[PDB]
Amino acid sequence: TIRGVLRSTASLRQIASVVNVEATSFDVLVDKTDMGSGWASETAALSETATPQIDRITIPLHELAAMPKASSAFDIETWLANRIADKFARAEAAAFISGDGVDKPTGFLTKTKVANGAWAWGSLGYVATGAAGDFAAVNASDAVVDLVYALGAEYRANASFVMNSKTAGAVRKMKDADGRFLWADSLAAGEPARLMGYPVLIAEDMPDIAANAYAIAFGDFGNGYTIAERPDLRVLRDPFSAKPHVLFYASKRVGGDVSDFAAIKLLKFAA
């Protein structure tokens, strides 16, 4: 049996809202503001209090394609089908997190972030850690806990952290003034998988800790990020074009950006 390198599988697919769509695009419809109702006066005109301005966000439903040429110990049809499904499960994971606008789903990091407390609708909110290189030196994890408690109590019913491996490394490297590992205290524990009472998703397409990078996200992505897709995978078992190489054609179409800008909060490693 032919082996391959085992890549990361966690993909933000299982915590975001997966919607089977059949058309060319998926239009989510979110109001931007409140009703604005006031307490009425007993002798006043009292008319036209306000109306929420709605907004259509378009999931463009892009397509993803990989085209390998095939060029009896192991059987290529099953193996290449088990590799290209993995690559389509992994290459859309980068687009879900840091994809840009052109021909691919725009990830939640590329949505013009604004510091929380001055949060408006068109952006995502972040909280600063302190010094630019890493977590704060005096009190580590204060950035983590106020990232949790600067989101909103309705979305924190089912919210999760999104990191890569070597940011969860730097989280588990946090220790008290005796060096006793605030998260998973002993050297015998392991991954506790319940950071601050919330699950952790190790998604490798997140950036690592840098001068300004947003290496930790937290949110109810079921309301936040909408993955609209078509469930099938095209299989053109092509017997033409090149006699020498089969050149199988496999494509899945998928789209997605943020549906709710209030659900996702980011951790900026700066001041």
């Binding site: 040429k69 095939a70 060029s71 074009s241 090149a242 006699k243 020498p244 190489h245 050149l247």
Partner: protein
């Protein structure tokens, strides 16, 4: 598959001053140069005779192999045998655009099978209605001294013959012209499809 030459031999690389030593013309005459215009006319006529019977090259001039469809799915054996450093597999289009391609092709050197085998299991594809010319410099060496000497002798046994008899007049050696050539000819036994 056309296989023309980009540049010919310079002529100054041919050993006219040594071929004159071979043919026993004369040593110390004051003229010494009445034959220079014709001696290299027979050296180019004897090399080109042995370049076709052996499918070798002998001066390492640059070639251009303009072909359209690949002979086999990936291999593409080149005709002129002693090769080195295939320059460019520029892939022309149906008309006009010529895009040179690194393309992930290799070169397998051999005097018998100078292949151009591809590594991605398929050579770069060919725009339908367009050719794929390959520039490559194939031969033993740049100067005359870098040749195998027995093949260099087979030029001197042959070009001396053209100098000594002009028309086709009939006239057995252990290692003649032919017996020196035969370890440089191409020995093939395939008349098949692949």
């Amino acid at each position: 598959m056309m296989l023309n030459e980009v540049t010919a031999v310079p002529g100054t690389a041919l050993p006219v001053a040594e071929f004159r030593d071979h043919l026993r013309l004369g040593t110390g005459f004051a003229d010494l140069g009445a034959e220079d215009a014709a001696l290299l006319s027979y050296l180019r006529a004897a090399i080109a005779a042995i370049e076709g019977r052996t499918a070798k090259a002998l001066i390492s001039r640059g070639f251009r192999l303009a072909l359209t469809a690949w002979r086999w799915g990936d291999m593409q054996t080149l005709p002129i045998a002693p090769v080195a450093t295939v320059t460019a597999l520029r892939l022309v289009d149906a008309a006009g655009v010529e895009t040179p391609v690194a393309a992930g092709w290799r070169l397998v050197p051999d005097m018998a099978r100078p292949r151009i085998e591809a590594l991605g299991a398929m050579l770069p594809m060919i725009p339908t209605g367009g050719r794929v010319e390959i520039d490559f410099t194939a031969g033993f060496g740049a100067s005359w001294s870098a040749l195998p000497v027995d093949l260099a002798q087979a030029v001197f046994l042959l070009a001396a013959q053209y100098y000594e008899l002009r028309h086709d007049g009939a006239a057995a050696m252990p290692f003649g012209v032919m017996a020196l050539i035969e370890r440089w000819r191409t020995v093939r036994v395939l008349g098949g499809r692949p």
